[PDB]
Each structure stands twice: as C-alpha cells, then as structure tokens.
Amino acid sequence: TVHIDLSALNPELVQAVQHVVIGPSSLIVHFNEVIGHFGCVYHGTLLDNDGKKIHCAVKSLNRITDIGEVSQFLTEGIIMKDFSHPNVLSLLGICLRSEGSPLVVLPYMKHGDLRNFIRNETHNPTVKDLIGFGLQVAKGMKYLASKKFVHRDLAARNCMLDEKFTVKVADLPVKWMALESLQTQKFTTKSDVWSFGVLLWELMTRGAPPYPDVNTFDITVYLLQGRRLLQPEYCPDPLYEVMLKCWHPKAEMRPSFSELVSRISAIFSTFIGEHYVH
Amino acid sequence: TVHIDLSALNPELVQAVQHVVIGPSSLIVHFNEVIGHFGCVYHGTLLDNDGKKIHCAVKSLNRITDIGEVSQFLTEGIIMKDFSHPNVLSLLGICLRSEGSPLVVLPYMKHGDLRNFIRNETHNPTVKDLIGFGLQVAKGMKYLASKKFVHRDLAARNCMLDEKFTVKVADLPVKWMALESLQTQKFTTKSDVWSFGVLLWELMTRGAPPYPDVNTFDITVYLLQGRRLLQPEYCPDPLYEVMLKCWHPKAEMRPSFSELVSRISAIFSTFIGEHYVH
Numbered sequence A, B: 001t002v003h004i005d006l007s008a009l010n011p012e013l014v015q016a017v018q019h020v021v022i023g024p025s026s027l028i029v030h031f032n033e034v035i036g037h038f039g040c041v042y043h044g045t046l047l048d049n050d051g052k053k054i055h056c057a058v059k060s061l062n063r064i065t066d067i068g069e070v071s072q073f074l075t076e077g078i079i080m081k082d083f084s085h086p087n088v089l090s091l092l093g094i095c096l097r098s099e100g101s102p103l104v105v106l107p108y109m110k111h112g113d114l115r116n117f118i119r120n121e122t123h124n125p126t127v128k129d130l131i132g133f134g135l136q137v138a139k140g141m142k143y144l145a146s147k148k149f150v151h152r153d154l155a156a157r158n159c160m161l162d163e164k165f166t167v168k169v170a171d172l173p174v175k176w177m178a179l180e181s182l183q184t185q186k187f188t189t190k191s192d193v194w195s196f197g198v199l200l201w202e203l204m205t206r207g208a209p210p211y212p213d214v215n216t217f218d219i220t221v222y223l224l225q226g227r228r229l230l231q232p233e234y235c236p237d238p239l240y241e242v243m244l245k246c247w248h249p250k251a252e253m254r255p256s257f258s259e260l261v262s263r264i265s266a267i268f269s270t271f272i273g274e275h276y277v278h
C-alpha cells in the first residue's frame, strides 16, 4: 500500500541525487527471492550497458512513508555513494519509485555478516584470521573517521564478508556503547573506538555475547565501577591491552583508528597460520 | 569549540543548498543579544543589495557536530525554503560556517509563540479571536499536508504570531499525540489532525495545560477508555464537536485539514467581536 508522491520532492535535491539513482533499465529485482536480520532484502541483478550482470542485495525501506523521510533517504544516498574504501560496503545505487518503498542496492556479500561467520562451527578461523578481520574493520573505520562520518552502531553483526573474505563495514545496543554515549546520549568517532574494542572482543571469542551476566540496565554502573570485558581465552595480551585503551573512561585518551590500524597491524604480523587469507 | 570541516561535505548537495545559504555579505548576527524556550536564538539583521534591513531571529544549532548531521541540516533547509504560505513560518536562509555552529534564519515574530500570547493576561482575545487563530493554523496545516509534510509536534507553543497577528506554524509531547502514535510510534497527517484538536483546546482555554489530572504515562489508557479533553468554558458546541472528530480513535475517520478549514471557517463567520484582526 506504499504510493509515494515523487513530484512533492524538491528539484535541487532530486538533481543532486541523480548520480546515485538506478532504475529498471539496469536493475532486476527478484522480489520472490529473499536474502534472510537486515530488514526486507531481495536478490537483485545489476546490468551495465553491454549486459554484464552483478549480483546485488536490494533492501526495501518499508518504513519510509513521508517526503521528509524520503528527502533524508536521498541525502544518506548521496553521502554513502561518495565513500570508496575496500573495507567499507559500497552503495551501488538507490531506487526512488512512485509505487513501492524506496530501495537500497548493495553488492552481494557471499559470507554474510561477520558475527554469523565466526559463530558458524564449520568455519575454522585462526587467531591470526580473527585479528586480520579486526585490522580490516579498523582500516574501514580509519577511512570513515577521515571523512568525518560517525558510525554509531559498530558491531560484528554490522560488518559484512565478501567471497574473498574482505570485511566491509556496513550500517538499542547498550553493551557496545561508550560510557559517555550511555549517559550524554551523544556519539563521536571516540565512541566508535569504544564499540570497536567490543567488536575486537566479539572476534576473539568468535561471537560470544558480551557481559553475559550483566543486565543491560546495569551496564553503566558496571563500567563506572571500573569493570571491563574479561580477556578472551584466545586473545593475546597485547591485543587485550588495545581493547582496554579502547574502553578508556576519558574519550580523549582513547586511541585514534589511525593509531589502532598501526598497532593492530604490528600485532597481526607477529602471528602465523591463516585459513582465510585476504 | 565548534569547528566543522566543510570540505568533508558532498559537492552535489552543497550545490543544491546554495539557494538557501546566506552569509556575512547580507546578515548581521547580534551574538550579544538574545531572543529568550526555542534554543539559542539571537537577534539578527538581514540586508538586501541596497542596504534595506529586515529584523530576524538567528537560531544556533549547537548540537550539530558531525557531517551526517550537517548534511541532514542542509536537507531540512532545502525542504523548508520551498514552503511559501502566510500561515507557515518562512526560512530566510541558513548559515554554514567553518567556525561556530550552523545557523537558521527566520523572520522576527513580534508577539512570540501563540501559547505565551494567549496566556498573557494583558491580552484580551475574544472567542472569535481564538477561533481565528485556530483557523489560521488549519490553513497552514492544509498547505503543509498538501506538500506531504508531516509536522509531528503541532502545539500552541510551536505556532508564532507576527506584528499583524498572523499565525505562523513553526517547528516528548505525549498529551498532544494521536492514540496510534503513542503505541505504534509512527506519525502521519492524520496524527497531526489529532494534535490540531488539542491545539484548538489550548486556544479555547487560553493555554491551559491539557489533562491536568492524568499522568503522562496513564494517557494511553485514559484515551482507550474513551475519555477526552472536556469542553472548555468558552468553547461553543460546534467547535467542541470538531475537536472530538479530531480525536477519533480511527485515524482514517478524522477530518482532513481541508475539511477543518472549511468547517472552522463557517463557525468563525457566525461569531462577532474581535480585538486581534488579521
């Protein structure tokens, strides 16, 4: 029952978004074929001018009803389309339709999200593999921070993994949130750094749920008492130290993603044995 | 301590927003002179090319820190700038600065917000006057609904009043929210219609607080029990009937703003005696 009045949109903005729009001249959506946790996502195929096919995921934004939301949707499209880094999920385009919800078009990620990948017992990542995934996320966050983009929901579940095992950073979650975000409601690159530390912990435990024994409403006190996620069984000491610095109570004292890439890269090189080479 | 990196913004969007941007070649902000409830708002003066001055209000968006928020701010600017109706507050422009928070520039409204105006005992609006204010708001909402814009926070406090006593619709509030908004979290033009009915009630009581004896967390049950705001002492029966229809439990059965303008206009014409002629 979604019929959006596209004539109601502003002309200057529609002009700005043209370079992001893709349509039925290029994209086949398979509305009968679902990609099963990230909303309503369909299999799609994107053709260039000679008819070459690219497998994509096509997400239907079924909440977007009004022209404010559609205008915000267009803006998010313009922003994301500019980003170009091998560790940040690409936006292939968006669809602005007069019938049906707006669509977002992403490259197909063969191995799904990182959390489900590492939890799957049939996969056998080494400690080096898991640290490597962490380093890839750091590089993507370094790029995004360089663009002044604040992630706000960084977590293993929001990182994707392609057929070459390249981690693509993509996309309430109190157990990932910085202390200051929990109380002042505000998010920064420094709070993304805190979430990154929790993501590293997720990696080293192969997707264990963090703080299993603390209620979500008792997390602020736990953290103020100076308590932190315990060092995972497979996590080496130098990596656990990096995690602890990511959870510094003073956001200003946390390392930058640039600092993290450098440190983690040094740790990764001392490790040997990999089953998932990038 | 606000230093936003404007080079980080997208080129196509910056091009789209140019027609909304105003700068130091036209605008004098009096940062030492405050307009005292709507955030940080300063007196400003806007000059055209021959040096003619227009009194404005200049609001400093001190929350806007990151490029996502700035991009969303630009989009809101583009949308609002298109709106042109005598009962909707105009956007004179926005300021995108490399130092200091983004600014929004609005025409100065001599008589402030409608709620404070009607509560001020030194003003003497008649029943016709109050209904007239209500009709003006309805006309503004009719325009906005025609543009597919959903208000979400319609209330007497968010309507402004200029020197000619023209009401300008401008800008959590559970006692104004539709039943369905309270439970499904979603907002529509039909939920704006519900808030409009509460605004009419505010008008007819000269800014009394609604549902004085019900806690904000008991409002959903109160409404589900079929209870409604009582008919104000000065509210005529036909207007109270309009209010009741605005609070129909079925959003689809509520009148349109177009229907409201027509009905309220008929009621207003049967009234005589005014101190605030539009």
Ligand SMILES: COc1ccc2c(Oc3ccc(NC(=O)c4c(C)n(CC(C)(C)O)n(-c5ccccc5)c4=O)cc3F)ccnc2c1
Residues within 6 Å of the ligand: A035, A036, A038, A041, A056, A057, A058, A059, A073, A074, A076, A077, A079, A080, A089, A091, A094, A104, A106, A107, A108, A109, A110, A111, A112, A113, A160, A170, A171
């Ligand atoms: C094989 O299993 C899967 C499972 C899910 C897959 C998959 O899921 C998604 C993964 C990510 C996303 N979307 C995002 O990451 C989005 C991002 C980062 N943005 C931008 C922003 C963060 C600013 O909102 N948006 C977005 C973009 C434009 C308009 C609106 C939202 C998005 O939709 C949407 C998805 F459907 C993509 C590709 N392959 C997959 C493969």
Ligand SMILES: COc1ccc2c(Oc3ccc(NC(=O)c4c(C)n(CC(C)(C)O)n(-c5ccccc5)c4=O)cc3F)ccnc2c1
Residues within 6 Å of the ligand: B035, B036, B038, B041, B056, B057, B058, B059, B073, B074, B076, B077, B079, B080, B089, B091, B094, B104, B106, B107, B108, B109, B110, B111, B112, B113, B160, B170, B171
């Ligand atoms: C004499 O006393 C006063 C007191 C307040 C006054 C006054 O207060 C304001 C009244 C309204 C507003 N702002 C709005 O109504 C805004 C609206 C409707 N928008 C658009 C939207 C609803 C989509 O957010 N915005 C807005 C616009 C551009 C960018 C960001 C937000 C706004 O700032 C800002 C104000 F400072 C304006 C003029 N005269 C006044 C006079």
